Structure 1
């Protein structure tokens, strides 16, 4: 009794877009997409067995439409399978936060938390479990506007971001995503620290069983840290809902310095305007 997935799968002529540079290495390039009969230029990222998987990704990305999730613009079916998406010029948020450590205020950190919760709440609406929420998989369109990406694991192994019940019984829920939301917030609040750094993943299951959790980040008031901790409750239903994380961080974002203590407080069209 599910709704029909009427998303459109756009097939792009490879002559419609111009690669311009490698961004990473699986390979992602920067380029420009010029819809043939349209006077627009669109900044884009361009990304058996392997083909099957990347098309699962294309499936998920084409089926989401929300200001805080990356949506597939199209695929190109040439010698290889290329996913074409909105270019996120500032890269992923894990790198971004490490590079600008000394220039990120409480307002930005809390706003990122709100926007990521909105993206995740949207995916919950769409009955989608991301299964790989993490700061590396959140992209930065502008410092003011981040979006969740990498749906290569989503469904309707990153041990250090995973709910305990996922490490134990490979169970995954919107509430196991909340757990990953909490590890991702911890990544941001520590300006990109590696969680459980030095602790091999084999030990993670046991550490979490003894009751250990990531420590309280220096800039974090107990209010913010307490929210993180709640995402790490053993009882998955005792963890916050995304719609609540949105609300709580919204409140905090209205007075950020009360919640984070930080020393120093032509013819181009962005994809978001190409509908």
Structure 2
């Protein structure tokens, strides 16, 4: 009744790509990928490890290779040199959490609402593929262009960050697609607050209890009650009361159609290069 995962895992020669710049510390690189004998150049992020966490990175690669959706990060390949190197599409504008901090005084309602739509789209795809993220958060969304974000970090993904977790996750390490909706709510509240830290200062030992008291994250200043309503439904203790990712797509799309009705915001060589999203 479960279908066979016929995703392909592509092994790359170290020959086939070049590092260019360090993006962070294993270690991730901006780099270019020339497929073998194809006359295309593909901007990539390359993660070469530096151990028995070799099991952890293969799980990520397994997951990343089995997804294909415009709002989830796909594996381009792996390279089994003396360390494991994973190759994936370069997300030029970094991670949405940093981006919303760096650009807050020029992010408008249309962008925020569209990010909410794209993230719900990605998350709904993971649901389709009977996949649970378990670590949805603003830090784990990357920005290809400002008009185009993708869900990432598939370490935790299955077929810790207490301040992002459904209550049933905090209590009984339970995890659903509805557990992910709760984290979707926190993520939106991150965006809606231009990168504020949830429950700032509250020690995470208390988080489980305050939520039992019925407390939740406050309504961000830019948020109409319509938007905040939606965030609050993602945080029902009754997980079947929370909204479905397909419904969040619909709701935020409705609003994206008239964004200023729903968010009130003061002031509304490189020759053969092909973007990964066009390399099939």
Scaled to the shorter chain, the TM-score interval is over 0.9
Cα distance in 2, alignment partners of residues 207 and 76 from structure 1: 46
- State the alpha-carbon separation in 1 of the partners of residues 117 and 97 from structure 2: 16
Q: How many Å separate the matches in 2 of 1:217 and 1:129?
A: 27
**How big is each residue's C-alpha offset from its partner over 1:146-166, in whole Å with a ceiling of 9 and x where there is no partner?**
000011001111100000000
Deviation (angstroms), 1:80: 0.7
Whole-Å Cα distance in 1 between the matches of residues 62 and 242 of structure 2?
29
Any idea what the Cα deviations from partners look like across 1:56-99, whole Å, max 9, x if unmatched?
00000000000000000001111111110000000000000000
Comparing 114-123 and 196-205, the one that deviates more: 196-205
Tell me how far apart the structure 2 counterparts of residues 83 and 272 of structure 1 sit (CA, whole Å): 17
CA distance in 2, matches of 1:49, 1:196: 35
SS state at 1:119 partner: helix
User: C-alpha displacement at 1:25, in angstroms?
Assistant: 1.8
Match of 1:175 in 2: 178
In 2, distance between residues paired with 1:16 and 1:215?
49
Distance 1:250 1:145 in 2: 15
What SS class does the counterpart of residue 264 from structure 1 fall into?
coil
Matched, 1:53 2:85: no
Distance in 1 of aligned mates of 2:65 and 2:9: 6
Aligned residue in 1 for 2:25: 25
Normalising by structure 1, what TM-score? Answer: 0.99
Shift of 1:49: 2.3
Q: What secondary structure, in the 3-state scheme, does the structure 1 residue paired with 2:197 have?
A: coil
The size of the alignment, in residue pairs, is 275
User: Could you say what secondary structure the match of 2:77 adopts?
Assistant: strand
- What are the ranges of 5 or more consecutive residues in structure 1 without an aligned counterpart? none
Measured after TM superposition, the shift of residue 269 of structure 1 is 0.2
5+ residue gaps in structure 2? Answer: none
Deviations 1:3-56 (A, max 9, x none): 100000000001110001111122211000000101000000011421000000
Partner of 1:215: 218
Deviations 1:190-227 (A, max 9, x none): 00000001111111111111111010000000000000
Q: Specify the SS of the correspondent of 1:251.
A: helix
**Runs of 4+ off more than 3 Å:** none
- Report SS of the residue matched to 2:229: helix
Structure 2 CA distance for aligned equivalents of residues 223 and 121 of structure 1: 21
Match of 1:272 among 272, 277, 280: 277
Measure, in 2, the Cα distance between the counterparts of 1:184 and 1:116. 9
RMSD (Å), alpha carbons: 0.7
CA distance in 1, matches of 2:200, 2:250: 31
User: What secondary structure sits across from 1:83 in the alignment?
Assistant: strand
Distance 2:210 2:46 in 1: 39
Pairing partner for 1:197 from 184, 197, 200: 200
The residue that corresponds to 2:108 in the other structure is 105
TM-score, normalised to structure 2's length?
A: 0.97
Partner of 2:14: 14
Could you say what secondary structure the match of 1:165 adopts? helix
- Secondary structure class of the residue paired with 1:123: helix
